[PDB]
Design a binder for these strands. Structure first.
Ligand SMILES: [Mg+2]
Ligand SMILES: [Mg+2]
Ligand SMILES: [Mg+2]
Ligand SMILES: [Mg+2]
Ligand SMILES: [Mg+2]
Ligand SMILES: [Zn+2]
Lengths: 329, 121, 53
RNA sequence: GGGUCCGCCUUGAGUGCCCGGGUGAAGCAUGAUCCCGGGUAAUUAUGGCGGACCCACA
RNA sequence: AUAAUUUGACUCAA
């Protein structure tokens, strides 16, 4: 009943004396509303009807944005958690697209099966499953393995089975339900589906329907009230909550935003259990997202060593002028 | 009660509203369902708008009270959408109904309109 | 739609009354939205009164 | 030479689906059916081209 | 441009 996004890491302190200057940078709280939007992500409750792609098009049009992208395609009839990264935050979806997801599904059986048998057989689907993407898909139709982290049956009303399921990204629930029906012998189809979790995003007070999103927008635009629309948009830092982090010194920030790789002497703090090749989020000591990168060292190697490239910086999100140039020749 | 319910309707008055829908269904003209009802209001054709109190999500009918007030059209609440649907002569629920021609419910709709007016203030 | 959610504890259920806390459940799926939003003015008038704006 | 940042490496027409307008009848008025109109996302990697910054062990 | 990813897309013509 837990996904990889729920597993927490210990913080390893490399430099205890490292502190941050309050005059530099823009932490989420200090961002003016216009800047907040530029580096924002919406935890959208998608309605049934439109495709996820159309919904993003609608958001772009209504909020007058040049750029937006979602964290994984929900089907037209499917509702629920759709992370929509905005403007300068658009590329953060690369941390969201391959992330674990949770669904609540309604399965309709084509025959009568005892409740204990349903529970028993559905338990057998936890673990690795082999799927081929359906004729209607956005990816290559080849056999591939996907992980089902957990299945929890909530309730059964005759042929209708309501269940929660945690899956690896790109797991087709309609196909999963089809094979459960085959394992039960009678056959089954998916009648209803809702996404309840997408990476770090879930059903909390930040989850917002299109109705509330646009209404809060006009409360700002036309009423002059910023508070509601501010809470409608999450800082891009939220889209990075599930990733291992390296916290860097002020004097290393501008260098990274200007294209430098992250060397060992720039690290103040870091999460434990980082392996070579892992995707890490480079953060300031104010918890601003600076960049995404690939670890060239393990957590222990970053902590013990005094020299060398710790993180290969790949995607810079922070503007160059938030922190002053503090590097030397 | 949901936040789109602006005033408390006594049992007797709610039953008269359903009675008026049944009579206007048989002897006059009605529109049933929220889209039909909304169009009737905006076109200025509705004599009375009937709104169910158990509509979920609220957004289906939430626009109707402010719309009716703008168009100067009286509205009334009934406790049950299934019951309102039944009164409208359909097999399913109706979130809202508009009476266009009261027919033999002429005097009943007039009474309802009088009683909602004092509830509004 | 058959999937319902309790407003109190967040339980997903098919029942009208939550099997965990007993609260009256609501449909889990959001209502239809349109970018044309022809009645947005009237929905916002309701919403402002609810929120206290 | 390298890295980061931005842009580009087709455009139409149609199907599907949806949304609006009109119509307003198992499932279904929280919208059947048909007509008209419109809408339909990004990311990653590699390469090429145009541009902006920087070359940084903190 | 080419190859991929994401639970939803497909066909044709320059
Ligand atoms: Mg239509
Ligand atoms: Mg035709
Ligand atoms: Mg058409
Ligand atoms: Mg170049
Ligand atoms: Mg120039
Ligand atoms: Zn509950």
């Amino acid at each position: 009943r837990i996904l990889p996004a729920d597993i927490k890491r210990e913080v390893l302190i490399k430099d205890e004396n490292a502190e941050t200057n309050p005059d530099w940078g823009f932490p989420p709280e200090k961002r003016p509303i216009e800047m907040h939007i530029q580096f924002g992500v919406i935890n959208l409750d998608k309605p049934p009807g439109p495709t996820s792609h159309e919904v993003v098009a609608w958001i772009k049009k209504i909020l007058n944005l040049e750029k937006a992208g979602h964290g994984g395609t929900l089907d037209p009839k499917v509702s629920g958690v759709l992370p929509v990264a905005l403007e300068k935050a658009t590329r953060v979806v690369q941390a969201l697209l391959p992330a674990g997801k949770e669904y609540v599904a309604l399965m309709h059986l084509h025959g009568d099966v005892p409740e204990d048998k349903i529970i028993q057989v559905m338990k057998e689907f936890e673990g690795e499953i082999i799927q081929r993407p359906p004729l209607r898909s956005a990816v290559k139709r080849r056999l591939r393995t996907r992980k089902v982290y957990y299945i929890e049956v909530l309730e059964i009303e005759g042929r209708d089975v309501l269940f929660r399921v945690g899956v690896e990204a790109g797991t087709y629930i309609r196909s999963l339900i089809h094979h459960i029906g085959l394992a039960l012998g009678v056959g089954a189809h998916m009648s209803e589906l809702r996404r309840t979790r997408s990476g770090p995003f879930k059903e909390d007070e930040t989850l917002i329907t299109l109705h509330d999103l646009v209404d809060y927008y006009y409360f700002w635009k036309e009423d002059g009230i910023e508070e509601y629309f501010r809470k409608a948009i999450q800082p891009m830092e939220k889209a990075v909550e599930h990733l291992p982090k390296v916290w860097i010194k002020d004097s290393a920030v501008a260098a990274v935003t200007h294209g430098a790789d992250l060397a060992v002497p720039g690290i103040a703090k870091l999460h434990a259990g980082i392996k070579r090749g892992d995707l890490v989020a480079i953060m300031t000591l104010k918890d601003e997202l600076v960049a995404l990168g690939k670890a060239m060292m393990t957590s222990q190697e970053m902590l013990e060593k005094t020299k060398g490239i710790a993180v290969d910086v790949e995607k810079v999100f922070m503007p160059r002028d938030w922190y002053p140039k503090l590097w030397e020749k | 009660k949901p936040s789109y319910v602006k005033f408390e309707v006594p049992k007797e008055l709610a039953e008269k509203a359903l009675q008026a829908v049944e009579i206007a269904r048989d002897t006059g003209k009605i529109r049933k369902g929220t889209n039909e009802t909304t169009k009737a209001v905006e076109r200025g054709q509705a004599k009375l708008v009937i709104i169910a109190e158990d509509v979920d999500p609220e957004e289906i009918v939430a626009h109707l009270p402010p719309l009716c007030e703008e168009k100067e059209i009286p509205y009334i609440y009934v406790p049950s959408k299934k019951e309102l649907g039944a009164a409208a002569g359909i097999e399913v629920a109706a979130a809202s109904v508009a009476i266009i021609e009261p027919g033999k419910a002429r005097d009943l709709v007039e009474e309802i309109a009088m009683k909602v007016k004092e509830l509004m203030k | 739609f058959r999937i319902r959610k309790c407003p109190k504890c967040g339980r997903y259920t098919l029942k009208e009354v939550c099997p965990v806390c007993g609260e009256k459940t609501k449909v889990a799926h959001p209502p239809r939205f349109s970018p044309e939003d022809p009645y947005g003015e009237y929905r916002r008038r309701w919403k402002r009164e609810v929120l206290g704006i």
